[PDB]
Scaffold this active site. Structure first.
Site, mmCIF file in Angstrom:
data_model
loop_
_atom_site.group_PDB
_atom_site.id
_atom_site.type_symbol
_atom_site.label_atom_id
_atom_site.label_comp_id
_atom_site.label_asym_id
_atom_site.label_seq_id
_atom_site.Cartn_x
_atom_site.Cartn_y
_atom_site.Cartn_z
ATOM 1 N N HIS B 89 0.833 -1.186 0.000
ATOM 2 C CA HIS B 89 0.000 0.000 0.000
ATOM 3 C C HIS B 89 0.877 1.249 0.000
ATOM 4 O O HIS B 89 2.025 1.230 0.450
ATOM 5 C CB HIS B 89 -0.910 0.025 1.226
ATOM 6 N N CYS B 131 -0.447 2.671 -4.338
ATOM 7 C CA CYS B 131 -1.181 3.871 -4.719
ATOM 8 C C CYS B 131 -0.343 5.113 -4.460
ATOM 9 O O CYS B 131 0.581 5.116 -3.643
ATOM 10 C CB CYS B 131 -2.503 3.972 -3.963
#
Lengths: 4, 142, 85, 87, 139, 4
Positions: B89, B131
């Protein structure tokens, strides 16, 4: 599909 | 040669894969199912390009920093380059350890010429699957 | 007679600044699987910029929520890079 | 079908993220001067990524005058195809 | 499918924004040497086939309005679009003569869903400006 | 030399  | 990196050293170099799938609940981050397929494909692909591939699973932020710092102090004289893949992430400029966020720059900066002499003049490649924010790209008709 | 401390880095991001990046829970992330596909077919022949541009193209032609993804790579390389077999 | 809204952008920066960029008062800026030198010699021949890599090279080997400093240009590509300035 | 189509009727527009003189409230110094940059860019991109337009000393509002006007121009018969920004800046930001504007406010004007005549065509931005306060002392 |  997933998001990171 | 003036225009191309010398890529015929005795070793291609290391490909270091940090594959973070399971996160501490205090982070609120979901398990990243599918990432093991990424890590498996990457090891096959980069082994085929001559790299010595190392896969690390579920590293804390401190472990990520210390893992890369040790590698930055190794002898890269005989290596063509260095490759690192981060699977996690993230947000803009950041990626998750299992326990929390870490700046990408804190990891890339370990390999700057002023700190890693035996990689001076050689490619340092980072591939980052994470991301970089929460905007959505809806596309356009073509 | 020095070179910049930031010289010869290349950072290949799965997605554009500010955007989500997609991961398929069966097949893996859109970016890594495209990267591996292109590297497996072309990696011993093409320069790294050509490789990463093809990855950009491959990811840009995908879908699903019906959203899209555009990878982005930032180069401070000073020469051409070939993974010479 | 669809293509991303951010597709087919290329941003060529004079310097790396976080850093100063240098400008000489008589010659102009290090980045623009090298960019034009490379474009003038190879602009109608080489692919754009190749051109910008040579620009990176030329600036990195250029040193300032805050004295004795260096500069590293950085270009970010969302292009999907090769780009030639065909004559 | 692998190379941009670069045989349209015209190469396209090169737009140069050349900011040299800044209002006193910004505290930014005069960018001596930038006129030589602009002139070099003009001759260089014209030799590559571009039509060239130079703007000088634009406010932040004028930068946004000028590029918005360009994003509405007729690019259908063009290969691509080039913008060069010459100014002061910080990370993600560039100075108009009167203050800063985000680079994304300028580049977003040309995204696919807003500038249809450039969809599928290269949009190139060259940015001469600082991106922070860090010094590279080299190796 | 100056900075931008």
């Amino acid at each position: 599909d997933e998001v990171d | 040669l003036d225009n191309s990196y010398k890529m015929n050293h005795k070793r291609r170099g290391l490909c270091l894969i940090i594959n973070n799938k399971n996160f501490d609940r205090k982070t609120g981050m979901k398990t990243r199912n599918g990432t093991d397929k990424d890590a498996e494909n990457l090891e096959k692909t980069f082994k085929s390009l001559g790299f010595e591939v190392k896969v690390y699973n579920d590293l804390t932020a401190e472990e990520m920093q210390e893992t890369l710092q040790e590698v930055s102090k190794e002898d890269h004289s005989d290596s063509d380059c260095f490759v690192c893949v981060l699977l996690s992430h993230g947000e803009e400029g950041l990626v998750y350890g299992t326990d929390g966020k870490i700046e990408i720059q804190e990891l890339t900066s370990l390999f700057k010429g002023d700190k890693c002499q035996s990689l001076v003049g050689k490619p340092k490649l980072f591939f980052i699957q994470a991301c970089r924010g929460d905007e959505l790209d809806s596309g356009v008709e073509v | 007679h020095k070179i910049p401390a930031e010289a010869d880095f290349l950072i290949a991001y799965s997605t554009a600044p500010g955007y989500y990046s997609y991961r398929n829970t069966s097949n893996g992330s859109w970016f890594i699987q495209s990267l591996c596909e292109v590297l497996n077919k072309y990696g011993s022949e093409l320069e790294i910029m050509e490789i990463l541009t093809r990855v950009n193209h491959k990811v840009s032609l995908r879908s699903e929520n019906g959203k899209k993804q555009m990878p982005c790579f930032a180069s401070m390389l000073t020469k051409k890079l070939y993974f010479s077999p």
